[PDB]
Design an enzyme around this catalytic site. Sequence first.
Site, PDB file in Angstrom:
ATOM      1  N   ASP A  14      -8.301   1.568   6.711  1.00  0.00           N
ATOM      2  CA  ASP A  14      -9.195   2.423   5.938  1.00  0.00           C
ATOM      3  C   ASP A  14      -8.431   2.948   4.710  1.00  0.00           C
ATOM      4  O   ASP A  14      -7.546   3.782   4.852  1.00  0.00           O
ATOM      5  CB  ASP A  14      -9.637   3.585   6.827  1.00  0.00           C
ATOM      6  CG  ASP A  14     -10.722   4.437   6.190  1.00  0.00           C
ATOM      7  OD1 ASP A  14     -10.505   4.910   5.059  1.00  0.00           O
ATOM      8  OD2 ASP A  14     -11.785   4.640   6.828  1.00  0.00           O
ATOM      9  N   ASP A  40     -13.849  -0.271   1.257  1.00  0.00           N
ATOM     10  CA  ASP A  40     -12.581   0.317   1.685  1.00  0.00           C
ATOM     11  C   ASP A  40     -12.235   0.242   3.177  1.00  0.00           C
ATOM     12  O   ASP A  40     -11.340   0.963   3.655  1.00  0.00           O
ATOM     13  CB  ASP A  40     -12.531   1.776   1.232  1.00  0.00           C
ATOM     14  CG  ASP A  40     -13.678   2.599   1.785  1.00  0.00           C
ATOM     15  OD1 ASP A  40     -14.473   2.080   2.607  1.00  0.00           O
ATOM     16  OD2 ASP A  40     -13.780   3.776   1.392  1.00  0.00           O
ATOM     17  N   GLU A  41     -12.921  -0.632   3.910  1.00  0.00           N
ATOM     18  CA  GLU A  41     -12.676  -0.767   5.349  1.00  0.00           C
ATOM     19  C   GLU A  41     -12.638  -2.222   5.792  1.00  0.00           C
ATOM     20  O   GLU A  41     -13.482  -3.017   5.382  1.00  0.00           O
ATOM     21  CB  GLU A  41     -13.773  -0.064   6.155  1.00  0.00           C
ATOM     22  CG  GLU A  41     -13.922   1.421   5.922  1.00  0.00           C
ATOM     23  CD  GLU A  41     -15.153   1.974   6.626  1.00  0.00           C
ATOM     24  OE1 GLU A  41     -15.234   1.872   7.868  1.00  0.00           O
ATOM     25  OE2 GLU A  41     -16.053   2.496   5.939  1.00  0.00           O
TER      26      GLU A  41
HETATM   27 CA   LIG Z   1     -14.052   4.814   4.933  1.00  0.00          CA
HETATM   28 CA   LIG Z   2     -11.990   5.783   1.981  1.00  0.00          CA
END
Ligand SMILES: [Ca+2]
Ligand SMILES: [Ca+2]
Length: 341
Positions: free
Chosen positions: A7, A105-106
């Site tokens: 993350d 973002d993951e």
């Molecule tokens: Ca996130």
């Molecule tokens: Ca983030």
Amino acid sequence: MIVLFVDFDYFYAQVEEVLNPSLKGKPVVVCVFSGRFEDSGAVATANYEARKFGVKAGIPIVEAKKILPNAVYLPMRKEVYQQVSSRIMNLLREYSEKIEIASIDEAYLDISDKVRDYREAYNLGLEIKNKILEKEKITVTVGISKNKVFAKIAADMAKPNGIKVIDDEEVKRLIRELDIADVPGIGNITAEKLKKLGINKLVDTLSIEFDKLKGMIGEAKAKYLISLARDEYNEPIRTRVRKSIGRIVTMKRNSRNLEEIKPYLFRAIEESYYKLDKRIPKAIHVVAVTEDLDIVSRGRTFPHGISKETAYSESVKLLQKILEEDERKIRRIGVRFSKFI
DNA sequence: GGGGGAAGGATTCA
DNA sequence: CATGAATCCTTCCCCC
Ligand SMILES: [Ca+2]
Ligand SMILES: [Ca+2]
Ligand SMILES: [Ca+2]
């Protein structure tokens, strides 16, 4: 199975720091200016410095400024963030074949084979964090566990800039002591529906008749929570497939007038078409955000691909259907394309 | 009874 | 004050 979840921390704001390192240590707030009035809009992302004082995603920009009037406020630059993200994902790719890019973002990595023992996974984690910090100057949090859900919870517990492992023993403690609201996929709405069933922890889900839980939150969500509580959740890691592309824009002021709304709709279509690239959709949906934040839509599926000319024409018809079937004024208007050939 | 789209909507979350 | 897209749910429809 061993899943390692990555993350990127406060991603949008962090990228802005990388692009302007003199921002480091200062509170940075990335916003989406709606242009309705001075500073109208919302916070998209805030770094730790601003977040510790209550400035977080979702609050109005005006609200953030009353809390931290001296913070650095910047306009969201999505494509810049997407390109930095793409570079980071391709890097994670070199640690696994099995990768699920869940969002900008993951990402989840199935490193069940490239390691064994939570010692070796942990090490792969610290390594990954170093690789990213070095090549892109972006700090990320890593979560490690037996399945995707707990790998994420691990990350949630360790953020920012951390690495956490949830062994088979804490999974069992968490299954009893973790607020079910902190379980991924359980928003405020579901959390409240659960609260009214007695359910406050995962374990509580096994004391209820299935058909009751199902009637309350749906079959898919019921089975999901149950499998987790039974320590049987085991969904494979796989990057989902891009099913649709579109855009929605906030108008300078609410309206119900066709000619006044059109310019916004057409702009949405142009941007959508630019993003589709070589993709040809067979379906189009005009989506409207009413004055009360309610979302209404009308769409159509064609037996062939949709040309831009057809999109312009069909979108006007769909919008008219909306204005004709709903009395409420429109705040945001846009379109979504799907069923690619 | 039910396979199987299609349409409109409900939720989640950076 | 209020800012992309996957999953999932309900209803509806055509028709075997
Ligand atoms: Ca996130
Ligand atoms: Ca983030
Ligand atoms: Ca939650």
